[PDB]
């Protein structure tokens, strides 16, 4: 019984291992059961196929990597915040004189207390730390029909 705590197990070609009989529990951050999320990951795999592809740069079967999903969620998070914001301009800052942003803590709060359902499930933030606290880790397991959520 193998148990991979990597959040990318789903993106692994497990057919040979599948026909063996291993209990092969893992993890999955992506709620690909959602129709919108499955359409987004299919659109991303379609966009990554019209480019000259990179096979054997890993053992992905043509899926979205977790780092790609989190970056997608990041740009959607700042987009949700800017949509919910006031007239948020942008000030050209410096580094030799670190003048603080006059929109700074306002827009950082409007980022942090903003919830959104992205490709990794719910995106919520406990505003005392900045870490991602409420999140659903789906459990996948390898059976004869592939990788199924248990």
């Amino acid at each position: 019984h193998y148990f991979f705590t990597t959040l990318d197990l789903f993106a692994l070609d497990l057919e040979l291992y599948r026909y063996s009989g291993v209990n092969m529990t893992g993890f999955r951050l992506l709620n690909i059961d959602n129709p919108h999320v499955s359409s987004i990951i299919e659109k991303w795999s379609m966009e990554r196929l019209q480019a000259p592809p990179r096979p054997e740069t890993g053992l992905l079967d043509g899926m979205m990597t977790t780092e790609a999903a989190l970056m997608y969620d990041a740009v959607y998070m700042v987009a949700i915040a800017s949509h919910r914001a006031s007239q948020l301009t942008v000030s050209s800052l410096q580094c030799h004189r670190h003048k603080p942003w006059r929109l700074g803590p306002r827009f950082m709060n409007l980022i942090k207390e903003a919830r959104w359902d992205g490709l990794t499930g719910r995106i919520t933030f406990n505003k005392t730390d900045g870490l991602r606290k409420d999140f659903d880790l789906d459990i996948i397991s390898l059976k004869e029909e592939g990788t199924e959520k248990i």
């Binding site: 959040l7 991303w44 790609a68 989190l70 740009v75 987009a79 800017s82 827009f107």
Partner: protein, 168 residues
């Protein structure tokens, strides 16, 4: 009407184009597709591609970006670089949005970063809860590097509380 963000991406060479950068450009193009997300503003992006393991270059690009005008930075992959860019953004009060989890030296008191990667303590608690569900008795923990021991902290320390023998 514009809103400009910035992204600092580490790449070894240009043959392996960054999937982080590709997802970044994919996400900003889908935001420019969707006109239900404040359509009067257009969200544009400013990329800076740096070499791998260069906190100094990451700092230079962050400085140049904040001199150009950036509303939010998406930092690099390496931990020292993303902590340096996080401290730059925390001093400058611009938000920093990182997607890679970092080594547990987070006691630097910051409130201008969000780490979309799940908490390495919560992943260990999930692994412990799943092993307590499966009722295993002998578990062979196999890691790859010290980040792995930090991420399996709770599972390895779990045996004194619950009856499980652990070989590491």
């Amino acid at each position: 009407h514009v809103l400009r963000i910035g992204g600092i991406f580490e790449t070894v060479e240009n043959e392996p184009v960054n999937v982080e950068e590709l997802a970044f450009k994919f996400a900003v193009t889908s935001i420019n597709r969707n006109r239900t997300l404040m359509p009067n503003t257009t969200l544009t992006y400013d990329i800076q591609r740096i070499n791998l393991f260069d906190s100094f270059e990451a700092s230079r690009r962050a400085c140049d970006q904040l001199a150009l005008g950036v509303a939010a930075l998406f930092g690099p992959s390496h931990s020292s670089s993303v902590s340096a860019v996080q401290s730059i953004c925390n001093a400058l009060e611009v938000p920093h949005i990182q997607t890679r989890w970092k080594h547990p030296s987070v006691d630097s008191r910051d409130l201008f970063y969000i780490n979309l990667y799940p908490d390495y303590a919560a992943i260990s608690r999930a692994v412990l809860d799943l092993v307590l569900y499966y009722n295993w008795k002998t578990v062979t923990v196999v890691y790859e590097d010290s980040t792995g021991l930090i991420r399996l902290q709770e599972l390895i320390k779990a045996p004194s509380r619950y009856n499980i023998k652990i070989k590491i």
